[PDB]
């Protein structure tokens, strides 16, 4: 059967992963001990879905996952948690010390000693898979592990595995909020090393989700646990058709094809519209038109950028639940009638549609309401260039004075590596500009 491997690098990746595996265990009926109770009524089957969980003869389901942080805290919170008996004991704390928010430590000093083991475990997993269809890498531009180790890992995987869809889910650095003084450097170096290996990087920002949880869910003091549970749903919307049945199923390659026109503009943004409290779950219809328009509101985007300052190169709308195709046809027509939503002249067919019959699950203790309809929008737009520009400018403001560089050079790096990276990003900005120029004979 079809199988995908998730690699949760870093603190951020692991937290997103814990949320995601909570969600998947709830969706499929698995308990934190790995033991499904209702297979006694099924007698085998495939509802213990092989896209994520491998099954033993003893009735234990083990996720196809790998966890790396290069520090012992976060995974030790798993070994001593509710899901300590689910994951294989090969969760990889070989991290006697961390990367100190230095890509150089994450890619060379401690990039090595640990990656051989990571790759051996991935090899063991993939040998257990018949139809391996892609990788999902959860990480963060901003740190060292989630930047350098992810870069190195993608490099090795593009050698050992090759033409397998390597999708990424990355925390993008925000314009105002930032938990570190050296995120621009790391982000730029990571996008330099990854952009020749990744196929589609789904970018999120935390300011956006804070504003969403405030305006819509009405949480005035949210934390990361309240955030990642949204991100999980996005993955559950991307990975639905590989598990459940539907009318328009979307395999992973369909993203890589439809959202990536040119091989360097594979940076689409994620969006989830019906983010409503149980209070506002009443008072509202929650029809396809409402959700599909909410997905296009700039205030409900999960990346702090305005599509109105740019153009849409593509959009993939993945629906879940009591959804009829006519409603989607009508909705996309209403959007194409609206003038604030401008598309490129070279994409008259700009919409991809997917409909699954399985509605989302409500995680116990969560902030989201039970719904009959859910929608995830993955949109490739020219706006994010502005975001990139911001990062590049920050880089300049420090690289002019060579600040924080002796920590990188001091851990195995040449200074030229910086300049190189910047140039690539500049080119990328130009490439974005080049795809906004309307065509003339």
């Amino acid at each position: 059967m079809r199988e995908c491997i998730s690699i949760h690098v870093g603190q951020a990746g692991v937290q997103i992963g814990n949320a995601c595996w909570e969600l998947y265990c709830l969706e499929h009926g698995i308990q934190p001990d790995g033991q499904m109770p209702s297979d006694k009524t099924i007698g085998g089957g495939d509802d213990s879905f092989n896209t994520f969980f491998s099954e033993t003869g003893a009735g234990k389901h083990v996720p196809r996952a790998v966890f790396v942080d290069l520090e012992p805290t976060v995974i030790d919170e798993v070994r001593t948690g509710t899901y300590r008996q689910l994951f294989h004991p090969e969760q990889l704390i070989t991290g006697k010390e961390d990367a100190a928010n230095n890509y150089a430590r994450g890619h060379y000093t401690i990039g090595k000693e640990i990656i051989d083991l990571v790759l051996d475990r991935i090899r063991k997993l993939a040998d257990q898979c018949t139809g391996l269809q892609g990788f999902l890498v959860f990480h963060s531009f901003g740190g060292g592990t989630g930047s350098g180790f992810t870069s190195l890992l993608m490099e090795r995987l593009s050698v050992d595995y090759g033409k397998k869809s390597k999708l990424e889910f990355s925390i993008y650095p925000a314009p105002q909020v930032s938990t570190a003084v050296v995120e621009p450097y790391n982000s730029i170096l990571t996008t330099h090393t990854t952009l020749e290996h990744s196929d589609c990087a789904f970018m999120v920002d935390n300011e956006a989700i804070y504003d969403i949880c405030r305006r819509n869910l009405d949480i005035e003091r949210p934390t990361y646990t309240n955030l990642n549970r949204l991100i999980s749903q996005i993955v559950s919307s991307i990975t639905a058709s590989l598990r459940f049945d539907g009318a328009l199923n979307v395999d992973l390659t369909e993203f890589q094809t439809n959202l990536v026109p040119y091989p360097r503009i594979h940076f689409p943004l994620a969006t989830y519209a019906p983010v409503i409290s149980a209070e506002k779950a009443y008072h509202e219809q929650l029809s396809v038109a409402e959700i599909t328009n909410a997905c296009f509101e700039p205030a409900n985007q999960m990346v702090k950028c305005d599509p109105r300052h740019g153009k849409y190169m593509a959009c993939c709308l993945l629906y879940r639940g009591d959804v009829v195709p006519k409603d989607v046809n009508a909705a996309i027509a209403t959007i194409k009638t609206k003038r604030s939503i401008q598309f490129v002249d070279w994409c008259p067919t700009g919409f991809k549609v997917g409909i699954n019959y399985q509605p989302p699950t409500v995680v116990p203790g969560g902030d989201l309401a039970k719904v009959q309809r859910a929608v995830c929008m993955l949109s490739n737009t020219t706006a994010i260039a502005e975001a990139w520009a911001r990062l590049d400018h920050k880089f300049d403001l420090m690289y002019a004075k060579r600040a924080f560089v002796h920590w990188y050079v001091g851990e195995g790096m040449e200074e030229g590596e910086f300049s190189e990276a910047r140039e690539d990003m500049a080119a990328l900005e130009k490439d974005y500009e080049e795809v906004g120029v309307d065509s003339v004979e």
């Binding site: 060379y108 060579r402 050079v409 851990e411 790096m413 040449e414 200074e415 030229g416 190189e420």
Partner: protein, 356 residues
């Protein structure tokens, strides 16, 4: 006082190397005189840079082949006239790993560099005017920067498992920075300084890496001191007034990216230190370039030993010259460009040289 100089700039291009012939790389560096033009392989753009002198040693067939002795008589001989005039002098290289630096300053047995030519030419220059009116005195040392530590290379050693003795830097409130315990040995003939030199280079730290089979794991500074006693018209004691000139000839290490030339263990540590040192040097040049733009800037010298001992040899009181080295292969674009940019910056540094 009252002098106003410039830190001069020479730029060499080496031939195609073995790796560069194994992988058939094309030509990207071109010379049209003192102007040098480098354009990318993808025909992106063309950068061109103005310099004081250029040296196209690519192929022996070209016109204006800039061999060793041309580089010498264009750089050292002027600097030698300044050293005899009563100035201190410095000549320091810069470039990539394998870019052709130690081939220039010191050189190989059958094609010597500036060092075995500078020393011999000043010996000869003394031989033509060593009167009993004016007498001369020569001493020297030849020291090494390796892993933040100073070493003396002109030191005969016994057989040991632990024999490499690191010295210290100190700051004299007038003379400036200097080294504690640097054996300055008298050198009255060319055979003497040759024996010293071959005692030194055989002690310099080297190792085989991907880009060079005999690479330089260190920086090397060649300290040749020349005093000359002269008489002015006084009926008392004559042979009374001294004029000193300290010569500092500097060959640096490379940049050492760990992907183009993978290393582990000691070979990796040296690289780090090397890179760190070079980074600080860049800052100095950049900052001193800003001093030519009248801006208030603080020059970081103390972050490394190289930029600390050569403080007076970048600003201060000495006439200084830079030698950038580059490669014609289309691979080394970013390193070449960083080199040429640092040279363009160093071109603009002024220096107030003292007459001794």
């Amino acid at each position: 006082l009252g002098s106003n100089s410039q830190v001069t700039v020479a730029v060499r291009v080496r031939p195609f190397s073995k790796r560069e012939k194994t992988e058939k790389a094309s030509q990207v560096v071109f010379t049209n005189g003192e102007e040098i033009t480098v354009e990318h392989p993808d025909m992106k753009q063309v950068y061109s840079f103005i310099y004081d002198v250029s040296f196209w040693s690519f192929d022996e067939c070209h016109p204006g082949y800039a061999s060793q002795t041309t580089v010498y008589e264009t750089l050292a001989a002027p600097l030698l006239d300044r050293a005899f005039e009563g100035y201190n002098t410095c000549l320091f290289a810069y470039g990539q790993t394998g870019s052709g630096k130690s081939y220039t300053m010191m050189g190989l047995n059958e094609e010597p560099g500036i060092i075995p030519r500078f020393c011999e030419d000043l010996f000869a220059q003394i031989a033509k005017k060593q009167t009993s009116e004016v007498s001369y005195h020569l001493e020297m040392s030849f020291f090494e920067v390796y892993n933040e530590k100073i070493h003396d290379l002109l030191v005969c050693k016994g057989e040991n498992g632990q024999r490499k003795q690191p010295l210290r830097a100190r700051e004299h409130p007038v003379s400036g920075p200097y080294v504690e315990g640097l054996s300055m040995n008298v050198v009255s003939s060319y055979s003497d300084i040759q024996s010293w030199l071959e005692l030194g280079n055989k002690q310099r730290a080297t190792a085989a890496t991907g880009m060079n089979d005999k690479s330089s794991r260190s920086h090397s500074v060649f300290t040749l001191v020349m005093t000359q006693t002269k008489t002015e018209v006084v009926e008392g004691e004559e042979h009374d007034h001294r004029i000193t000139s300290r010569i500092n000839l500097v060959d640096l290490a490379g940049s050492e990216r760990c992907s183009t030339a993978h290393s582990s263990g000691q070979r990796l540590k040296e690289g780090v230190s090397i890179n760190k040192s070079l980074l600080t040097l860049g800052k100095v040049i950049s900052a001193l370039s800003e001093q030519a733009n009248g801006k208030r800037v603080f020059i970081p010298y103390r972050e490394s030993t190289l930029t600390w001992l050569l403080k007076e040899s970048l600003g201060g009181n000495s006439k200084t010259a830079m030698i950038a080295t580059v490669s014609p292969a289309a691979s080394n674009i970013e390193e070449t460009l960083s080199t040429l940019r640092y040279a363009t910056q160093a071109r603009l540094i002024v220096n107030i040289a003292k007459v001794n």
